[PDB]
Amino acid sequence: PINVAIFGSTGSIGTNALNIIRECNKIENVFNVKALYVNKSVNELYEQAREFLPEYLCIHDKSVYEELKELVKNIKDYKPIILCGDEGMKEICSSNSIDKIVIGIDSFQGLYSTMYAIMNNKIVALANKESIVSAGFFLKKLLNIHKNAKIIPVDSEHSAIFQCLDNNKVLKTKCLQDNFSKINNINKIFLCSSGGPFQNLTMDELKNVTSENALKHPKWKMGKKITIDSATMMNKGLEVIETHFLFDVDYNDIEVIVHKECIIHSCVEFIDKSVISQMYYPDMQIPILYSLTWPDRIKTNLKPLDLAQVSTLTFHKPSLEHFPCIKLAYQAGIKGNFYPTVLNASNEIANNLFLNNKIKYFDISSIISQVLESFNSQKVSENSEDLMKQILQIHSWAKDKATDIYNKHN
Amino acid sequence: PINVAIFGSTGSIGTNALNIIRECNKIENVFNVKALYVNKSVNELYEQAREFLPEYLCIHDKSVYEELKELVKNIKDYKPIILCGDEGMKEICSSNSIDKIVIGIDSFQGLYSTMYAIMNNKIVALANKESIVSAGFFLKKLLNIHKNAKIIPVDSEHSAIFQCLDNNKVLKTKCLQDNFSKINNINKIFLCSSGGPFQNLTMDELKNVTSENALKHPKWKMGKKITIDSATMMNKGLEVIETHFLFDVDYNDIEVIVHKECIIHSCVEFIDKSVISQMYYPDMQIPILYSLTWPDRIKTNLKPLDLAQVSTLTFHKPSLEHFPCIKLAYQAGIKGNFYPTVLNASNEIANNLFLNNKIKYFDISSIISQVLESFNSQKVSENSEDLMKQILQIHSWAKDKATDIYNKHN
Ligand SMILES: Cc1ccc([C@@H](CC(=O)N(C)O)CP(=O)(O)O)cc1
Ligand SMILES: Cc1ccc([C@@H](CC(=O)N(C)O)CP(=O)(O)O)cc1
Ligand SMILES: [Mn+2]
């Protein structure tokens, strides 16, 4: 019986997690939902709570804390531990009654619970790629300290890559650990992408796209922020850096491939040149589930892939000209240092502006490119808490600088 | 270092095996070729011996054994143990200095070599599916007795499927053994086929196709017999049974899929419904190579898969009306008992007649169908030696029944 906590339980990853968990539990009782944690969604949490009845509830924003107790009151034969903020978050990570933590809080704020999940040597099922991109080297140092903690990727491409690996080797290492790719005989990664809605647009058509265009006909069901990143392929860029960090794969050996059917989720090339890939319908339930069952698999009632019906699969290289965010991610990644933290922060800002109709598509890459330009390598703090503050310092600087470039521009 | 013997070393899989070994040793000296064994190619063996300098040489035809000794005298700083016929074979199989045997021989002689390799607890890289199809029962019994013996599949679809498995699990069990499927969480198999050259033909065009038609559009570099089997899709049929036996997958759960680009070489659907696949250019070098390095992988100079250039992959179900051998194979296999030995032996005859323009395309399946129809289940021998005799008796009976049906035609 696997004891599980969900951070960001009402988010797209959270709901998907609870769903596959509920379906797998009907087949055979395998998961116990021990803890749910949301940012500010108290009605939604209350309804998850009545259904899954975990031991811990945790709302972050402490204003609506007393209100949550008000709703959960009205659930009979049930009284869970109710917490707030990072004190709840921490109490939860340290509970011995919990083994795996799904991190479905999905921006730089998710770093804290990831950090605390690792510090308590848990299995961390991680869907927050921003934290690996911003804090990769930090997480790597923290993992070297917490020897029994494990990051299991949930981001679907990285889960794919991870599922293409021989657990006989994986178990000799772990994600975010130097030498991972050598021990797994990995030569190269095909990092597949839906391409987003703008793949077939000309340069001129591209210049004009809006957030409304970007949000139309989602190939996956997801939040607004990553939908914009998919549109610019900043999502893929970030995932290039995430790949580098999770699997210690050089940037020369990560190739982005546009696969519009969303069936092959990514592929691994091994040192003999054999390639192994993972396929399924575009559904987040598989990668979430595998992160909770690894190194095993369990039965689901999910619809089986019908390859004949799907019939065709296609692959092409994205144009860096049309998708310059991809180039910027590689550049920042290759330069290393805190350039990735800057990439991610400036993008939080450019992303949201474009989503809110404040700038144009190419303004997104221009702003980001200028903030990267204006940053100078810093000496990397040896001390772990110094490194944290440094990362926050640079992240907050990068956001402010991006906002400044937008504000000074007509 | 990997200590390998090659049986049938001047043959197709033989020379392929030595080619990938030669290329891999140039990168990093990895394989020690311990024994070469040929039927009666004196000069070729001498030439391979000069290159790989194995400790054992063996030629089957005793008439050339003295000639061979004269030849190898001219290789400097070389004094191998030179043998002949089945005795040399068995002696090689008994050497503690040999870990893996590539079986590159067909017909009984190859089954005999397989048996002796297994009786000696070796790893057997088996590139001859007819023995699994026909003698599946016997091999399975044998592998139960010799617990440390392993069969590793070389047939490329089966290699692919094997490459798609988690060796953490594979190592708890082995191929051709009850429970392999349960232990590896395997739910279903996509068994990919090139489709051969007749996929788009109508029933009426099919009626009149010739062996000359069949031997066009060679997508892999292959011998005549398997090329005809590819055209009829009897190859895939046999391989369906091969899959049943190697991986303990029910026939209901093996789906033949026509994939004309020959990049995805087969796929495994696990019980969560996640699917894992192996891709590469159509080449027989990876599968041979993986059979020799499993559970590891080693570096090659093979041309990397360029997915963007490959660009498109296609999948459709084959029409059973057009390729009836497929149906016969499932029928024979599902019926079990010695029906697959009969299927295989009748096809041997049917295939060769069509190759030589003695019968038409639908006659192949017709002859085979009749032989299956005329065969009566026999109680299966408990005794390993009696079982082998049954298999041979039935195989000889079926060849003769098929010839007889052809003879009495018109
Ligand atoms: C609408 C939309 C479409 C697609 C995405 C992403 C989703 C993702 O990152 N997964 C599933 O792991 C895929 P991509 O960056 O290749 O376009 C997000 C939103
Ligand atoms: C010309 C030709 C083309 C293809 C084959 C076979 C080869 C095979 O079975 N491999 C390589 O494992 C593939 P299929 O039966 O799917 O057509 C044989 C001959
Ligand atoms: Mn992703």
Ligand SMILES: [Mn+2]
């Ligand atoms: Mn094959």
